[PDB]
């Protein structure tokens, strides 16, 4: 009955993603979660944030050790820049042994800047013995859940083939003069492939309940320099370097059914004139399913889902007629909503709301289950897939990735 006490590294009232997503999600669940702790390298920032958001149950901690050691925390949320995850999480995990109450470690995607760091973080987290969560909140999108339902229940029959087209938003020819350099530089754990393809391709695996068998990728830097623009979109006459990718070609096969998947991710603008900028098109033996989005990345955007097919809540249908479904939620705020539904699932698990008679204390991964939430193991498997995308590009070869979902040590 006691709220889950949350400690944040990276909640800042004046900027960042956590203030836009985690924070509003928590307000909606204020009997289930309470913010009790903040840590930032500058104490002033934590103090300013606690003031502005009136976080009356929160304490600003002066050091990582004091924060991580504190027994006032049940769940730690890491929402700082990915380039800082490893250097923060590793010592934190060790200090957190001083806290016998710690039950959850919740990290933003991407987990780390390289597979090696992801592997080390995962190992340390498993060693700590806490339930882990990764923010792959596309798995909690109502659109993704509905699609997963249709597929799993047999509405498209077997999957024949899949096409995916996405857009990375920032990696086109121009860059706003106010955009921060860090998302455009290699090694910072944020880029078209790791971040945007990351969310989208994991969404695909989740919806179809299959990992990949074989993959081939080509990664491009055809735009080594972007043109600075003002807010009105006018070029200011100055170029700046972009070392991260501006295009991704990916193709491969789903393990279940050897299903062909073709993907192209455009870096940014110009947007497409005659085609939606986000499309997931799934062709089955018995029906088709298509998800399209006008605005934004799959994991934070309001989509439309189209379905038509047959399997030839109980509805009385005619055997020789296609069923049509359209699924769109007009007033759905996906930026707040998908994260909110992720918190809801953490809450449901913690308080055992469904009252499932034998729900274990912890689970290693969500995998393709509807229930629960994605963990650091689901994150690690995604990192292994991203690594193979980069390796495939580097070696000029189609890679067998059929075993990346298996862990040994």
């Amino acid at each position: 009955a006691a709220p889950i006490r949350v400690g944040f590294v990276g909640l800042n009232a004046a900027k960042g993603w956590a203030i836009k997503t985690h924070y509003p999600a928590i307000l909606q669940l204020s009997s289930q979660f309470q913010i009790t702790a903040l840590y930032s390298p500058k104490i002033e920032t934590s103090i300013a944030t606690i003031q502005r958001l009136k976080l009356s149950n929160a304490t600003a901690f002066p050091t990582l050790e004091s924060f991580a050691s504190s027994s006032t925390i049940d769940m730690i949320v890491i929402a700082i820049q990915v380039a800082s995850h490893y250097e923060v999480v590793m010592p934190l995990l060790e200090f957190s042994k001083n806290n016998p109450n710690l039950k959850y470690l919740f990290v933003e995607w991407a987990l780390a800047c390289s597979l090696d760091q992801a592997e080390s973080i995962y190992k340390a987290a498993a060693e700590r013995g806490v339930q882990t969560i990764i923010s792959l909140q596309g798995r909690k999108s109502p659109y993704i859940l509905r699609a997963k339902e249709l597929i799993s229940q047999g509405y498209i029959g077997d999957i024949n083939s899949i096409e995916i087209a996405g857009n990375g938003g920032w990696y086109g020819y121009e860059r706003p003069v106010k955009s921060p350099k860090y998302i455009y530089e290699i090694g910072n754990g944020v880029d078209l492939v790791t971040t945007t393809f990351g969310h989208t391709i994991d969404i695909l695996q989740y919806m179809t309940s299959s990992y990949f068998s074989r993959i081939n990728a080509m990664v491009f830097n055809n735009i080594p320099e972007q043109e600075l623009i003002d807010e009105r979109g006018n070029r200011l006459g100055q170029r700046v370097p972009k070392t991260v990718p501006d295009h991704l070609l990916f193709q491969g096969t789903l393990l279940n059914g050897n299903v062909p998947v073709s993907c192209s991710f455009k870096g940014g603008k110009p947007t497409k004139k005659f085609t939606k900028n986000l499309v997931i098109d799934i062709h089955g033996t018995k029906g088709d399913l298509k998800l399209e989005g006008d605005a934004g990345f799959a994991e934070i955007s309001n989509l439309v889902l189209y379905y038509s097919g047959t399997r030839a809540l109980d509805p009385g249908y005619d055997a020789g007629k296609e069923i049509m479904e359209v699924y769109h939620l007009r007033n759905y705020n996906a930026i707040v909503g998908n994260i909110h539904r992720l918190y809801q699932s953490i809450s449901d698990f913690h308080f055992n709301t469904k009252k499932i008679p034998e729900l274990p204390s912890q689970f290693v991964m969500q995998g393709f289950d509807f229930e629960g939430f994605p963990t650091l193991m689901d994150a690690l498997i995604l990192h292994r897939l991203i690594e193979s995308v980069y390796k495939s590009n580097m070696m000029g070869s189609t890679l067998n990735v059929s075993n990346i979902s298996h862990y040994s040590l």
Partner: protein, 514 residues
């Protein structure tokens, strides 16, 4: 009459008042500042036409939603929601310090969404009347206890949204801010749309305008209007309507894509297929998601303005209305009678003279929907014929005299039976339980029996003579023995008592000050 009535201290209404005050106290350990009350409703006739802008014939009943409220003006402002029925788990949410609107997730069935949507429309209303006080600062927090004895099918969802909006306005404007019935009804009209149900304005209007011992004539066009009327005084008989609950599992939200919301879509497509066939254009409603592309009354008006001496829109005159609706039923026959099997998406597109893609964009993208065919014939026939039956019911109810008491019970009863037949065979919103209840009732003292509300479960109503010289107890006994004892053997004395109720028209929305 203009404003929502306010009270301080119907022997039944006092008993509930104290009962909820103590439940609130038991939950929150303090006494509440006020109670917002909003009653359930039944519709005598005129089912599934309100979102087509046709007038209806409802009344408020003696069951209500009670929201006991303690105001808390201490940031961090938060709202705690407790229900007397423990199956609706307690919620608590902090108000945005912005004070921006709170998000609502329309993808799930959630009892607090109804409170949240009433809160939203109130919030928006408040920002319009008092921009300086409400634009950049949150609402007051509150502890709230919700208790309802409205059976499912009794317009509980709308009573709840009305009570929620009422509470939000009262808590933020203060003790002596008069709240308009007209405004309360206007702002709540679209409230449930935010939670995934594309309903009409009947239930909100009824809950707000209800009056003790009066039924209502509720109109939507040309203006929202609710006219109270008493049942006719008969020679030696009491007119009454008994409500029997089907006890069917409530899931309007989960089935909306194939049931409630599909119907609304079907009647909009029908109006536009008619307009296309007769070469008239319909208005584009931008105020309401019911029918952004025009509805069946818009078609009636458009047809008449083009072909009947450039006639002005129907103003609600009974005689004129019967005439025009009879014409409409003719056009439905000419237009759709050869397509009783229904229209596939391709056929509906053709009928509207557009592509499948454009059809999908204009009609299928507003609320989730799932179907093989759209039954334009059956759905339009229902709406036009049902609207016709309301006009007939109204002229009866407003007649000062009738040949005999029997004549009234038989004629009015017949209109109800026709309405039921139509809801069942044409609109397909009845169910086995409804059908069983009605037939039994009719065979045992009722003159007319029909579902009320959305259907697919819910409640049923029955025209029966009441009082020492009536059939009330004959009907009740027959239902208990032949229906309830059969289908639901385990019902407890109280449940059984609750499954069947006799209500007089009740007072509308009101506040109790503490």
């Amino acid at each position: 009459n203009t404003n929502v009535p306010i009270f301080s201290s119907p022997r039944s209404f006092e008993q509930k008042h104290l009962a909820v005050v103590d439940a609130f106290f038991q939950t929150y350990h303090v006494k509440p500042d006020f109670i917002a009350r909003s009653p359930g409703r039944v519709n005598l006739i005129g089912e599934h036409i309100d979102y087509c802008d046709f007038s209806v014939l409802p009344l408020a009943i003696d069951v209500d939603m009670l929201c006991a409220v303690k105001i808390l003006d201490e940031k961090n402002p938060s709202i705690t929601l407790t229900n007397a029925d423990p199956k609706f788990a307690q919620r608590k949410f902090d108000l945005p310090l912005d004070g921006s609107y709170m998000a609502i997730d329309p993808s799930v069935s959630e009892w607090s969404n109804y409170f949240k949507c009433g809160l939203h429309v109130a919030h928006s209303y408040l920002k319009k009347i008092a921009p300086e006080r409400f634009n950049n600062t949150p609402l007051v927090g509150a502890q709230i206890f919700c208790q309802s004895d409205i059976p499912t099918g009794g317009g509980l969802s709308s009573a709840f949204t009305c009570a929620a909006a009422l509470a939000t306005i009262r808590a933020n404007m203060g003790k002596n801010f008069d709240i308009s019935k007209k405004d309360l009804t206007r702002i709540t009209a679209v409230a449930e749309h935010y939670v995934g149900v594309n309903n009409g304005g009947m239930d909100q209007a009824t809950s707000v305008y209800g009056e003790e011992d009066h039924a209502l004539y509720v109109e939507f066009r040309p203006k929202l209007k609710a006219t109270p009327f008493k049942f006719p005084q008969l020679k030696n008989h009491e007119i009454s309507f008994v409500i029997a609950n089907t006890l069917v599992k409530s899931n309007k939200f989960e089935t909306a894509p194939t049931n409630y919301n599909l119907r609304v879509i079907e009647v909009t497509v029908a109006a536009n297929a008619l307009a296309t066939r007769y070469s008239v254009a319909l208005p584009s409603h931008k105020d309401n998601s019911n029918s952004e592309r025009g509805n069946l009354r818009d078609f009636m008006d458009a047809y008449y303005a083009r072909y009947e001496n450039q006639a002005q829109p129907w103003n609600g005159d009974i005689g004129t209305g019967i005439e025009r609706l009879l014409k409409m039923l003719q056009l439905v026959e000419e237009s759709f009678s050869r397509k009783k099997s229904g229209f596939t998406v391709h056929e509906a597109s053709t009928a509207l003279n557009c592509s499948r893609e454009e059809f999908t964009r204009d009609y299928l993208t507003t609320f989730p929907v799932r179907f093989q065919v759209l039954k334009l014939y059956q759905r339009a026939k229902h709406v036009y014929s049902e609207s016709l039956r309301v006009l007939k019911a109204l002229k009866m109810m407003t007649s000062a005299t009738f040949h005999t008491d029997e004549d009234f019970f038989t004629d009015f009863g017949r209109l109800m039976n026709e309405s039921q037949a139509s809801c069942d065979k044409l609109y397909e919103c009845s169910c086995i339980e409804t059908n069983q209840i009605c037939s039994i009732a009719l065979a045992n003292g009722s003159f007319g029996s029909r579902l009320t509300g959305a259907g697919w479960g819910g409640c049923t109503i029955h025209l029966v003579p009441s009082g020492a010289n009536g059939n009330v107890e004959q009907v009740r006994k027959a239902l208990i023995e032949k229906f309830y004892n059969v289908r639901y053997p385990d019902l407890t004395d109280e449940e059984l008592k609750d499954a069947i109720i006799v209500s007089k028209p009740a007072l509308g929305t009101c506040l109790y000050e503490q």
